[PDB]
């Protein structure tokens, strides 16, 4: 389970890459970089996916801070792909600048302790992981409330300021 | 688990209705009718979903034999809905004449013993259930091979013939 | 128990050979060939044995597809033999072109999960096993309904088409 | 398991009746009479079935002593029937003057502790049971050696002489 | 332990009141109001307690939203009191407009899963609890990075907007 | 009861009254290479005139010329057994014997052969045929009041040996 | 061993050879209201001339006039016991006895009194003094080859009864 | 615990020596000699200590038979000493010709199974041990009844006569 | 075991009364009074008994403060008695003004956690118990160092001052 | 736990040094010296901390007896520091001549068995430890009653006198 100042739970799982391909991604492959790993409940929700899009539209701000961003849900990689092929205007995801993990077994959500067991979907959890793979901050929102790109960046800069 | 001449495993779960709405469906609500419950692995797969469509195109042939047909997968109801909104020509599902269960918790697949745990997806299992809710026949295919609408009908007629 | 894409349960047991002799047969001796292993409840049933005969009459069609066929029941090898010595017109089996396993311990039925424990007899289960010894499809019928030689051949071609 | 001066293990099972019909028979239905229950391994064995026949040819001798005799094996009732329809001269059983239990589940053999677990067949066990349902004597032979009708009668008379 | 959409872990503990008195406070006494419960590591840290002060300076903004705010640490109520008697200029806490729980047994921190067991102090955890006592959002920061009053208010308004 | 057909007959090494009147330790394995008829009886000095035990003793040679040794057993001490043999046959005693009699003082032999009546502390009239390989080949158990047949055991022996030959 | 000083002596109900020659069930509790000397010995018909058991039988009245009953016990059957009494005293037998002899066929009595030699299946020369209330009051246990003293047991009895009085 | 023909329970403990000194004494130091080890309840009991004295007055009789005698109780060595300094006429012990063990831990009494647990004192137990350290006879008296020096000597001579 | 502000461990045990008689004394019989219960190792020690005597010589000072004093050791009541009959000049105890418990089972020492298990004797433990039977202070000395009557009185007054 | 004549429970913990710095201190670092380790409940209590001050004012008296003195409580090192910065006249601690352990995890209190679990604070326990690290005396007071510097010195001198 996920704990501050302990190594963030490991995973190696299929993800939809920004280019549209499927690829296995391990957490340890990010060693040497900061990582913002964030979960969302379901693809194709009647929610306007503004939240997932917001993070994708902002990758480079995180990148300038040596931070990679990674999305995740219990949906398949095909579901992910289909959502990106769908129009943003029509409620789709459109192009993504970040990978989206396909947590098909729900185990990543489980290890990060964000799985709603009765629904089989993940809460809006977000985790900041340092270059050493250490879990440094936990944010978990109930389904109906989104996270803030600004806030995560606030936190990132703060953490990096302390390291300097 | 699913055993011949034992009551078929119970379930009550959200499904995508033929009209496009979401609805809770219980197995017991079919008491008095035959049921063909069949699983498939994933929505939006790169296999043209001929198999699921074949069963939908043939409901009537089951229906006049006092048999209801029910599809199921580990995908969400929103995923299901999205697939039906997708054009059949374009590898989508198009309109569906049968309900599709959203086994988001994988428990239905588990109880029917068709779940591939490592994958998180169900095998191509099909189950014939009588008006008394008794499991009467088991078919399970490996992912790459489809089932036969003709065969299931053969079996149905055979079973009903034995009742007279 | 038996599972798709797991090695099919092992066995080494006495069988009635097509020539009329008794012989020990192991599953692994079929490595390199496809196998259709199928169970039936009892020898000498008041149910005419059209089903078992149908598979025997069709061996070559299976053989041409690099597939061996194997029958099985809880009856002794002597019971098997006696049934083949009985005239086909008289409700007997006649000369068989396939071996018939004598599952006297009922353990083969048990491992394939087709044993009706209260009766001590096997359900009409049929299993397709690949040249690697991997279980590839499961069919189980309630006692009163037979299987289809055509259907098994349909699946066999389908499976081989996927490899080629 | 079966113990001297304890109630003989209960059973209710299908048997081939002397007239050729199938019938459920319980041990307790013999209360008030002595019973010689005896097991044999298999129907249709290559060795002339003189032993089973010997007991059938002698029923009236047992009946004279208020004793009923009951045969048993792991074979089905249909196997039993078929053996009696077979000519005695030809290695068959001919019509029998005693019922033959069809211990399909093997449980009767198990409870009397005569089941060879590796073979799935019963040893040549014979049990004398009194009118009170109490087990009074145990005889168990290895497969290749038969029992003696004279001896069982010796024992019967001895037991009845003591109760006199 | 603390879970989204489950009742927030109960507590009744001594707290330093804004007026300077000690008082037992239970979580359930806030039923009917929103609660922001937030932990901090230690009193008298060489950190300028800007964070704890920031929340105190902002109580009325939370109050206008029907939300009460509650601070907590493993320090005694006397330690709390002493810190408030200390000058803000000298690194003290000065006057507080919010109560500060004295989690002397560390059990509140434990139940909210924010206790650093090796240090015996709590991480910078913050929890939003609804009028029904249900846990609605989790924020946990590593020691050196503070939380944002603005962000918590963002979240509060969002939650209340959904309820309307 | 450990006593199972086609399994090695339960082992034992115990004091026995020898035909000559001496006490001697006897193990089952010492009979390897010979058939053995091991038979139990309830008690020495019983009010049942001991014809059964005597019958087997009077017939040893018949067993012996079948390459079969015969061995009696009961829960009584070796001294009890000896006393019984010193007692006159006419007078309800045993007389001198042609077979050894095991003194199953711990009752464990009877236990391992599953013939011990636990409430009484005595053995049922159990008889066991053991082959030259030490394998248990046939089980006979009688309730107390009914005896076994020397003829029958010989019938069985010949039958078993006939199967070995052909 | 359940046998503890100032605890109720271990219960039993078992067949015994009565002084008159009959078999009878005897329970410990049937002696309530009397002192009891219960004593064990290893085996009937031993090559030890049975002076010890005889000594206690020859002295019953001495125990009796102390309101004390005496009871012998061994793992031998009641038939063994009877046979021994039918045997002539001169000839190494027991002769007719003035005390009952328990037939501890299941060995449980010896077990509960903690005097059973498990490897031999026989009891040590244990002797137990039990009061009218059924309470165990003294324990004597001898190795096989050494006998007990009738005088000593009487010494003990008088001592115990003297303490009751004054 | 102590058993006939098993090695007598070991001990090494302080004892009051006949000369008035304290000394550690082990059971094994008597190997090669017979030992009469005997327990008594308490020092300074209101009843004239004739029993302990009787054994002391008779040591040479035991010594003649290559037998050493050893007294024991739960009292301290100082208690023992004090009792011997007390005048025999006055209810005291006087100087003893045998050692008296000070079983302060109660463990010797425990291992010889003579400890009255509720009182914390030992029963009047006496044990005869051979030159090989084997326990050869057990005598245990209830508190109010003494043992006999004559009897123990009777036993000793008997045992030695047998080994002769 | 014994704990501050928990009821002091119960006991009912024989004690040597100041008048020279034996009497059962329970802790609860002191309810309504303060109690100083103190242990010492052994009677008749080569260590002059100044400590035990000091407390006896001072009873009244304790009594005036509504406090009873109680001595205890693992020695028998007869040992106690004998020590008091011994002349104080001669290393004896003399007439005592306090009762002395005879903890023959060592259980009182055990429950107060002052038993030296290897020696079977108690450490120089002293316990102050209030009128409610609550344990209020613990003093435990290693064998060679005595306690102070003054100190115990200092504590007693202090405790009573806090109630008044 | 803390037992007389057993090694005193080990610890290594942060302490406030007399100079005002924080430093890790282990018990074993005192090997070769006597140690008076004493606990108190809480910093900033409304009791004028005369007791802790009394020991600090007297270090020298311990020091010349080759004895180091060590204070301890469950409060943080920062709490300790703050209390020493507070004016003695104002109920503060003022300058301290002894180190004060910060038992933030309450484990030292636990191992010395002085912790009041419900409170989360330690009782007024004091422990004398010899140069060999052996626990030699235990004093435990209920919260409202203080210990005596004189008494501890009495004990120290007594212990050292026994060593010569």
Numbering used by the authors:
A (entry chain E), B (entry chain D), C (entry chain C), D (entry chain B), E (entry chain E), H (entry chain B), ...: 5 to 168
F (entry chain A), G (entry chain A): 4 to 169
Relevant lines from the article:
Leishmania reduces the hydrogen peroxide produced by macrophages during the infection by means of the tryparedoxin/tryparedoxin peroxidase couple. Two enzymes, i.e., tryparedoxin (TXN), a thiol disulfide oxidoreductase, and tryparedoxin peroxidase (TXNPx), a 2-Cys peroxiredoxin (Prx), exert a concerted trypanothione peroxidase activity analogous to that of mammalian glutathione peroxidase alone. The two enzymes are potentially suitable drug targets since they are both necessary for parasite survival and absent in the human host.
LmTXNPx, cloned in the present study from the LmjF15.1140 gene, belongs to the Prx1/AhpC peroxiredoxins (Prx) subfamily, able to reduce H2O2, organic hydroperoxides and peroxynitrite thanks to redox-active cysteines. In particular, LmTXNPx is a typical 2-Cys Prx and forms an obligate homodimer, whose active sites are formed by the N-proximal peroxidatic cysteine (Cp) from one subunit and a C-proximal resolving cysteine from the other (Cr'). The structure of LmTXNPx was determined at 3.0 Å resolution. The crystal belongs to the space group C2221 and the asymmetric unit contains five protein molecules (A, B, C, D, E), modelled from residue 5 to 168 (4–169 in A), and 64 water molecules. The LmTXNPx subunits, as for LmTXN, are associated in homodimers (α2); however, they are arranged in a different way. In turn, LmTXNPx displays a decameric assembly both in the oxidized and in the reduced states. LmTXNPx was crystallized under reducing conditions which stabilizes the FF conformation. In particular, both the locally unfolded (LU) and fully folded (FF) conformations, typical of the oxidized and reduced protein, respectively, are populated within the reported crystal structure obtained under reducing conditions.
